[PDB]
Every structure is written in structure tokens, then in C-alpha cells.
């Protein structure tokens, strides 16, 4: 079964500011998770320049956007390097304490939540729109895991035995009842187009 972990003080701290703040431009969250995957594929590509059998676990590199109007999920899947268990636990490979500090000195002092990726913690903008995030990751040398949180200042990590994926990371947004517009064809295209045009990797928008 299913170990539970506390979010460090500062990361729990952040999250509640995200959940709680009145802030209207919630759409940046997709910019942020895109930029993250974009960062992970970069890492496996560099990694393959020296050892070309790292790409043994699926050799094409892309971001898929999969809306599901039925389960209220939107899922942003990539074939990037992936996280090991160790990573997942470390705020999903982010600097977080370090990062959040900078963020809030920049926050309380004239600058909005949209600059959150400039501090290395874009992931959490997920909670602008999601009431529960599930994160699926496989990385070559480890096995596959599921990280999950609905905030509340904790998170699960199970080793997951649903889908094999060879490599990369699946971020499932189980979206808030009133944010169903992010399952919309029109809206996701608008957003992926105005905020992630020059992401150097093919972004496929799935249709339903
Ligand atoms: C492109 S960036 O704006 O320069 C940037 C760079 C690095 C990060 C930090 N993070 C480190 C570990 N990362 C990683 C490694 N394996 N898998 C991931 C990964 C993580 C998340 Cl949270 C995600 O949504 C997708 C991923 O592929 C990438 C993102 C965030 C933004």
C-alpha cells in the first residue's frame, strides 16, 4: 500500500496561498506544466547525446494534452526523463523551500502569481484549477510510481501498477467543479497557443 508524507512547512505554505488568493488569470497553470515537461525532455535529450541507449524506453519526445470531460480530468503526459521516487518526494525535483522564499518576498512586494515559474515552482499552479493532482512517472533505472495530493498539507506515494509507460510523467488534473472550461477544445488551443508556442516539442491536443 500507500505511504504518506508531510509537505515541508514552506510548500504547504505556498499551496494555501495558491488555493486561497483571489486571483483571476488561473490559465497560466498550463503554461507551467508544459514548461516543466519541456524541461524534462530536454534532460533526456542531453542524456542521450552521450549514451544513446537511454532512449531505449520509447525514443520519441513530445507532450500530449488529454482532456476528459467525463472524469473531469485534464492530463499532461510527456516522454521526458521522469522522476525517481527520491525525486518525487523532493517536491518533484524542485528547489521549493529555497524557491518559495524568493517567491513570497517577490509576492508581498509588488508582483503577481504569474511569475511562479521564475522561482522553480510552477508545478503547484496546478492547484489554481485542480482539486486533486495525480502524478505518474517512470524513469529508466527505477520503476513506476504514483504521487498524489489534494493539498491539506500531505501527499501519497504508492508504487503504481496500472499503466506501464516506459518513460516520462503524467500529470492528472482532477479539476474543480467550476473550472470545466479547461477540458474545452477551443480554450486549451487558445491557451497552448498564447503561452507555449515556442516550446521546442510537438504538443498534441487529444480530442474526445
Ligand atoms: C523550462 S523551465 O521554465 O526552465 C523549468 C525547469 C525546471 C523545473 C524543475 N523540474 C525538475 C525535474 N523535472 C522533471 C524531471 N522528470 N520529470 C519531471 C517533470 C516534473 C513535473 Cl512537476 C512535470 O509536470 C513534468 C515533468 O516531466 C522537470 C521540472 C521547472 C521549470
XYZ file of N, CA, C and O in Angstrom, residues 17-18 22 33 37-38 66 73 98 103 109 117 132 161 196 198 200 203:
72
model
N -1.622 29.611 -0.268
C -1.682 30.933 -0.873
C -2.302 30.871 -2.286
O -3.134 31.724 -2.642
N -1.871 29.857 -3.056
C -2.442 29.477 -4.354
C -3.931 29.120 -4.336
O -4.696 29.721 -5.093
N -7.658 35.263 -3.983
C -8.393 35.701 -5.147
C -7.426 36.189 -6.244
O -6.692 37.164 -6.084
N 3.033 23.667 -16.629
C 3.214 22.227 -16.549
C 3.826 21.754 -17.853
O 4.646 20.817 -17.867
N 7.507 19.803 -18.417
C 7.725 18.633 -19.300
C 8.802 18.995 -20.284
O 9.780 18.256 -20.425
N 8.583 20.116 -20.978
C 9.602 20.761 -21.815
C 11.028 20.704 -21.190
O 11.995 20.283 -21.844
N -4.574 15.598 -22.961
C -5.723 14.671 -22.985
C -6.866 15.175 -22.047
O -6.867 14.911 -20.837
N -10.985 15.144 -15.716
C -9.552 15.306 -15.697
C -9.048 15.971 -16.954
O -9.689 15.890 -17.984
N 13.794 26.982 -0.603
C 14.662 27.881 -1.381
C 13.816 28.758 -2.338
O 13.735 29.981 -2.170
N 9.936 33.583 -3.754
C 8.641 33.877 -4.289
C 7.912 34.853 -3.371
O 7.453 35.884 -3.820
N 5.751 42.035 -2.089
C 6.390 43.258 -2.635
C 6.217 43.537 -4.170
O 7.197 43.538 -4.930
N 6.771 30.375 -12.127
C 7.795 29.553 -12.757
C 9.213 30.111 -12.733
O 10.166 29.350 -12.973
N -7.513 17.814 -6.945
C -6.619 16.662 -6.659
C -5.623 16.486 -7.879
O -6.058 16.462 -9.025
N 0.631 0.272 -10.197
C 0.589 -0.929 -11.072
C -0.543 -0.945 -12.120
O -0.878 -2.010 -12.652
N 2.523 28.894 -24.949
C 3.545 27.886 -25.201
C 3.845 27.551 -26.698
O 4.323 26.454 -27.037
N 6.467 28.537 -28.639
C 7.875 28.219 -28.873
C 8.394 27.239 -27.836
O 9.455 27.437 -27.235
N 9.928 23.868 -27.762
C 10.554 23.094 -28.808
C 10.164 21.626 -28.967
O 11.011 20.843 -29.361
N 3.328 19.327 -29.406
C 2.218 19.225 -28.458
C 0.936 18.733 -29.134
O 0.292 19.432 -29.938
